[PDB]
Design a protein around this ligand. Structure first.
Ligand SMILES: [Mg+2]
Ligand SMILES: [Mg+2]
Ligand SMILES: [Mg+2]
Ligand SMILES: [Mg+2]
Lengths: 282, 282, 282, 282, 282, 282
C-alpha cells in the first residue's frame, strides 16, 4: 500500500517549510509519494485560490489520501479562502498553522478539517527597514532549530505518519484527522528528552519562540513610529536567536547522556527508534 | 511590468529550499509572480520527470519567463533527466545544485541553460542510524544560518533579481542566464562585510560547510562498517554546527560596527540598501 | 542640604533589593542619609504592617523627606496594607513593585502615592520542589544582571535622584512623585546604548524576563500536577538565565565600542557621566 | 515553636545581602520570624551605631533569639563599633563579613560572638571613574551567582538553620555560635557536587573570587595613578565575571547528571533534600 | 635500564614541538634520558644538516637507542637532507611530519626510517602581512589544543613509549619503527572517548584542522594578490580556532561523564591509566 | 651582519617553549642564526649541566653573540648550575624564568646575567593522578594562548630584538642585558590594545594565570592528602582554561575594532607594524 498526499504551501511558516520532509528524511521511503505546490511567500486570496486549484487539478490524476495546507495564520483572507475550498473538495485535509489560527479552531472542527497549530512558530518581524532577504533566512534558521531540537517536528511527524497509516486503509474519517495545538506545554506529556533539564530548556525555548509573535505583531502592525518599531521587530529576532541557543543547549545535554532520541523511517515506512549513538534503530 | 517563473523542488538543498522566498521576503513585491511544484525529497528520474511535467503543464496558462529547478546534484539520474526536459522547452531555465554538479557544468552550458552551484551546500549524513526527521531539520537549520549570514544567499538573491529585470524586458537570452559557482572565495569579490574578520570568519564558515560534503559522502557511500560510518556522518554534522557559529559570529561583528548590510526589495521589486540600523533603506 | 529617606522592604524583588544602593554606589555621597527597614521575605498584611509602623516610628526622629515601600505585588494584602498606611501618614511616599501592581496603578494616584513598576522584575518559580535557597539566589543573580545591564536600574536611579533634588527644595508634592511603569519599550525612549544592536538585545532580555512571570504564575498558582508544575517553575528559570545572557551580550557590545555609559554620583550628589573608559565622568 | 532574629546591614556584602533570605526562600516558614534594619551602603561608626541602636531599640518588643550584623570589613571603624555594642547585649550575635575580618578573628571569639567570614566575598573596584550604580549591580549579580552556584550559600543556609534549631531549644550558648571562614577549600569538606569537575570548577570559581579582592584593594588603596588604577579595578570586575561563568559551568555539569543538590525548607523549617529533578524533596 | 634518544627539531610542527615532552610529562621518569637539538624555525638544507650534525656529534658519547627528527614537510630539501643523513647512520630513526610527507612515504621506508605523519598538524597562514609572532603563538595554542584533546598526542606517546621499551632491550629493528599516518579516522578505532559525541566532536575537529592545510597553502603559495591571500590565510586561522573549540567541547563531555582518560607514566616508565577523577592510575 | 645566539631549554615553561620562535616567526629572517639544545623536561643539575656543556661546546665553533637559558625556577639546583656555568663564560647570557626566579634576582645581577621573569608563566598541576601527557599539552595550549593574546610574548620579542641589534654591532655589555619581570601591570603601559576593555580583559587573564602558580604549588608541594590535592591541581588547570578565554575575548575585541596589532619581522630583521587587517606592515 503506497500512501499519497499533496502539500499546498502559501506564505511562510517554519512548520510548513519542513512538514513533508520530516516524513521522508532520506528520500528512501517507498511507502509514500508526495506532490508539493504553492505560490511562494504570497498568500493573498487571489494566489491562495490559484494554488488550491493546482492542488485539486493535480489530485485528479494523482489521487491522494489527503491534502495538507500549510501557511501562516489560518484565519486570514488567503488561508480562509483555501480553508473553505478544501472542505468542499472530495479530499480529506489538514491545516498547518500558527497561533493566529485558534480564532478559527472551532470553525475548522466543524468545516470537517484536521489541523496542527504550532504556537511557537511565530511570525517574523517584517518591516522593510529591518527584514531584508538575509535577515529572513537567518530568522528561519533559528526557528527551525527550536522546532527541530525541542521535539515539535517529531510531534508533527508522528501526526502525519499516524495518518498515512489510516490513509493506507483508504479510510480517512474526520475522526482520523489530527487536531493539535502545539506549545511549550506539549513536552510535558511526551518522552522526547531523557534528560529532565534538557526538557525544561526545550520548554523555556518554546515559550520564548511563542513570545516572539507578540513582539513581531506590535512592531509590524500596532506601532507606526519608525524610530520605535524597527528596534521592536529586531528585538523579536534577538529573542528567537536565544530560543534556538536554548534548544541547542538542550540537545547537547542529551548528547552528554548519550540519549539523543532518534526516530527514522525504514524503507517500508515504519518508524524506528534509538537512544544510544551506536545503537541500531529498532 | 510583472515577471513570472516557476520553481521545481525535488530532493532537498539549502538553496533550493529558500530560492523563491529570497526574491520576495515580505511578500509585497508586486512586480513578480511565482509558482512552486515538486515531489518533496524524492528525486529519482520518475518523480523528477513527473515534477518537470507538473511544471511544464502549468507553464501553459502561467507562461513563465523562466523555469527554475532546484535540488541536490544536477548530475544524478533524476536531475539530469529534468535537465534534459527543461533544456528542450520554450521556457528559459536555471539549474540550482551543489558541488557534485560541476561534473555536468559544461554539459549544462551546452544544454543552453543557466546554473547556480553552491559548493558549501553540503550533502547531509543520510544514514538510517543517524539521520531521523529531527536531526535532518537540525542540520538544515545550521546550513541555512551559514548560507544566509555568510552572504551566500545575497549572491543568489541578486542573481534571480538581475534576471527578473531582463525578464521584464521580454528578452531572456542565454547570455542573460546565470553561470555561477559559489564557494568560500566568492566573498573576496564581494563587499558583503564591512569588518575584515567578519568576512574572514564567513570565509572560514563556508570552507567548513564545503568540507562537510566529503565527510557525508564517505560515511554514506564509502565506509561500510557500521561502527565507523555512523561516527563519520555525525562528525559531519558537528562541523556544520560550528560553521553556523562562525557565521553567527561574523554577523555579530557586523552588528558591533553597526554595518549589517541589508538589501530589501522595494514594493516595485527594486533592491534597496542600508548599513546602519536606523538608516532607512535607500 | 542633606536629603533623607526610609526604605521599607517586605518580601523580595530585584528592584527593591538594590534601590537604595543605586543612589550611593560607593557610599561617598555627603548629600544623603538613608534608613532601611524590613521584615525580610514575609509580606503578609501582618508583617507588612509591623514594618511600616517601624518605619513611621523612627521617621519622627529621622525626618525623611520621603519614604519608599518596595516589595512584590502592590495589589496584595500586605502591600495594600502599607499602601494606605503611607497615604495616611504625613510623609511623601513612592511604591516600587512588579506588573501585578498595574491593577492598582490608578488607585495609587488617588491615594496620592508615587510609583515605579518594573514589569521585567518577575516573580520566581517558588515551588518547594524546585526553589531552595541556592536556586533563589541564582535566580536573583540573573535578574539583577538583567535589570542592571539593561539600563532599568539607571531608570530607577534617575527617578529617585531627581526626587532627592526636590526633597532638597523641601517641596515634594504629588506632582514631584514618580509614576513610572518600566518595560521593554522603556529603552526606546532613552539613549542608554550607543550601539543599536545592544539595545535590541537589551529589549529582548527585558522582554523575556517579563514573560518569565506568566510561567511562574502558571506553575505556582494554576497548575497543580507535581509532574507538571516542577518542570514549569524550572523552565521559567532557564528563561531568566538566558535573559541574563542577552543582557551580558548587550553590555559587551557597548564594550567593543567603549561606549559603555557610566553615571556616578559626585560627593555632592551631582550625577556625572561618561562613555569612554578612560574619560573621567563630568 | 518559632525562632526570631534581627539582621543589621550597613555597607554591602554578597553574603549580608542574602543571609536572611537564605533561611526562608519561599516565605512559607512559619517556625521563624525576622526583622531587618540598616543604613544602606553607609557604614561609618556613626551610621553603624545608629543602626545597631535601631536594632537594639526594637529587640525589646521583638525579643530576638540572636542578632546578626552583616557588612564588609568587620575590623574597620564602623563594624568594630557594631562588634562592641552587640557583644555586650542580652542577645546572642553573629558577625558576617569578608576576608579582612580575619585580623579581628581572635577578638571576636573573645567578644563572645559567632562569625561567618567569606573570603571570596571580595570588595568591588570602588573608584568614581569606573563604578557607577549599574556596574555596582552587575558586579553583585556575578558574585551572587558564584556564591550561590558554588554552594557557598548552602554553607550559610545550614549555618543559620542549625543555629535556629538550638534557638527553638531556648538554649543559645556561645559554644553554639558559629565560627566559620569560607574559602575554595571549604568545598573539599562538602558533598555539594556529584560531578568532581563541577567541584573543581566551583573551587576555581571561588579561588578567582578571593583573588578579586587584592586587585580591588590595590586599585583602591595602593595605586594612585588614574591611568593605572581605573584599569586595575576594572580587571577585578572582569575576573569576577569569569568566576561567575565557572560557577555556572559547575551547575550545568550537575544538570547533565541530574544531580543538582536542592535543600528547601519544609513549612515547619526542617530542610529537605534531593538530587534528581522530579525526585520530590525528602 | 635507561633508554636514550635524541630529538632534532627543525622548523615548527605542533607535534615536533611536544613530542619529547609527551613522554616524560612530569619529568619524573627514571627509565629515559633525552637530548634535544635544533636550528629553531629554519629548516633549509644548510641548517638541517648543521642540526643533524649536532645530533650525530652528541650521539657519539650519548649513545642514543633511537633518533627522532621532527618538523614540517619530510619531502622538502632540508628535511630530505635529514632523512639522507639519518638513514646513513647506525641509529634507528623516526621522522615526525605533516601530510606533505606522504609524497616521500615510500622513499622513507626504503631508507629504513620510521615515521608518524600527522595530517591535522596543518601549516599556518605564513604571510608577512598577517603572521607576526603573537599570531604564530595563538595559532599554535589552538593547534596544540586540537592535537591533545582529540587524542592524537596519546597516539604519538604510545608509538614512542613502545619504542622506548624495545630500546631498553637493545632490540630496535627497522620493522619495529612506526609507519603511521594520523588523521580524523584514526580516532574511530581508539579507546579515547567514553562519550560517542565526544569522539564525533574530536573527529570534526581533526577534519577541520586537516583542511586548514589546503587554505594556508593556497594563500601562501598559490594566490599572489595581496588583497586575496591575506583574508585567505586569516580564514585558515579562524578555522583552527573553531577546531580547538570542538576539541574542548569533546573534553568537556568526558568531564560531564567523569570519564576523562589519563595515561600518566609511573616513575619506572610504565604507562598507567584511569578514567574517573578520584580513581588512581594503574 | 648575522646575529647568532644559542637557546638552552631545560624543564618546560610556556615562554621557554616559544622564545626563539618568536624571533623569526616565518623563518625568513636573514639577520639571525640560532642553535637550540636541551634535555627536554629534565632540569636536574646533572642534565642542566650536560645541556649547558652541549651549548658551550657548540659556542666554540658557532660563536654566539649571546646565549639564552630558559626553563622553570632559576633558583632551583639545576637552573642555578646553568646560571653559574653561564656567568663564568665569555658569552653574554639571559635567563628566562618564572616567579620563583625572583628569589635569585640579586644573584643574577651580581652574576652579570640578564633575565626575563614572566610571573603569569605558572607551574602546572604536576601530580601523577591528574597530569598525564595530554593534560600537560592542554594546559600549555591555554598558557600559550594567554601569553600570546595578552601580549606578554610581544614584550619578550621586543627585548630579544633589541638585544639582537646590539649583537649585530658586537656591543653587548652587561648593562645591555634585560632585567625584566613581567606580570599583569606590565600591560598597563603598552600600546597593545586599542580597545580599553581588551586591555582590561587581558590583565584579568594575566592576574589569574599568575594565581594559578600558587594553587599548583599548594597541591604539589603542600597538601599531602591525595583526596585534596588532586582536586586542587585540577582546579588550577580550570583557572588557566578560563584565563585563555579572557585572552581570547580581548583579541576578539580588537578584531571587532579592526585594531589587531601585528609586529612581524622584515627579511632584514626590521620589526614592522600594523593595525588594520588590509594595512601593510611598516
Ligand atoms: Mg640501520
Ligand atoms: Mg637499509
Ligand atoms: Mg662576560
Ligand atoms: Mg661580573
Amino acid at each position: 500500500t503506497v500512501a499519497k498526499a499533496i502539500f499546498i504551501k502559501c506564505g511562510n511558516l517554519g512548520t510548513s517549510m519542513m512538514m513533508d520532509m520530516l516524513l521522508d528524511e532520506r528520500a528512501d521511503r517507498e511507502d509514500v509519494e508526495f506532490r508539493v505546490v504553492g505560490t511562494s511567500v504570497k498568500m493573498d486570496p487571489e494566489c491562495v485560490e490559484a494554488a488550491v486549484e493546482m492542488a485539486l487539478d493535480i489530485a485528479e490524476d494523482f489521487e491522494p489520501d489527503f491534502i495538507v495546507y500549510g501557511g501562516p495564520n489560518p484565519a486570514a483572507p488567503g488561508p480562509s479562502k483555501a480553508r473553505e475550498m478544501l472542505a468542499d473538495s472530495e479530499y480529506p485535509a489538514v491545516i498547518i498553522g500558527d497561533a493566529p489560527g485558534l480564532k478559527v479552531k472551532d470553525e475548522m472542527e466543524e468545516q470537517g478539517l484536521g489541523y496542527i497549530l504550532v504556537k511557537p512558530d511565530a511570525m517574523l518581524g517584517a518591516r522593510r527597514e529591518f527584514l531584508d532577504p538575509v535577515e529572513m533566512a537567518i530568522y528561519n534558521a533559528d526557528l527551525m532549530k527550536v522546532l527541530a531540537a525541542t521535539g515539535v517536528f517529531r510531534v508533527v511527524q508522528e501526526a502525519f505518519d499516524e495518518l498515512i497509516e489510516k490513509a493506507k486503509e483508504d479510510e480517512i474519517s474526520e475522526n482520523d484527522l489530527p487536531k493539535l495545538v502545539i506549545d511549550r506545554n506539549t513536552l510535558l506529556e511526551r518522552e522526547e528528552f531523557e534528560n529532565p533539564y534538557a526538557m525544561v530548556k526545550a520548554m523555556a525555548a518554546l515559550e520564548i519562540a511563542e513570545n516572539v509573535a507578540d513582539v513581531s505583531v506590535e512592531g509590524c502592525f500596532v506601532e507606526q513610529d519608525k524610530e520605535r518599531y524597527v528596534p521592536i521587530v529586531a528585538s523579536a529576532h534577538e529573542m528567537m536567536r536565544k530560543a534556538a541557543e536554548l534548544a541547542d543547549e538542550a540537545r547537547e545535554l542529551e548528547k552528554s547522556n548519550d540519549a539523543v532520541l532518534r526516530t527514522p523511517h525504514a524503507p517500508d515506512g515504519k518508524v524506528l527508534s534509538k537512544r544510544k549513538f551506536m545503537e541500531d534503530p529498532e
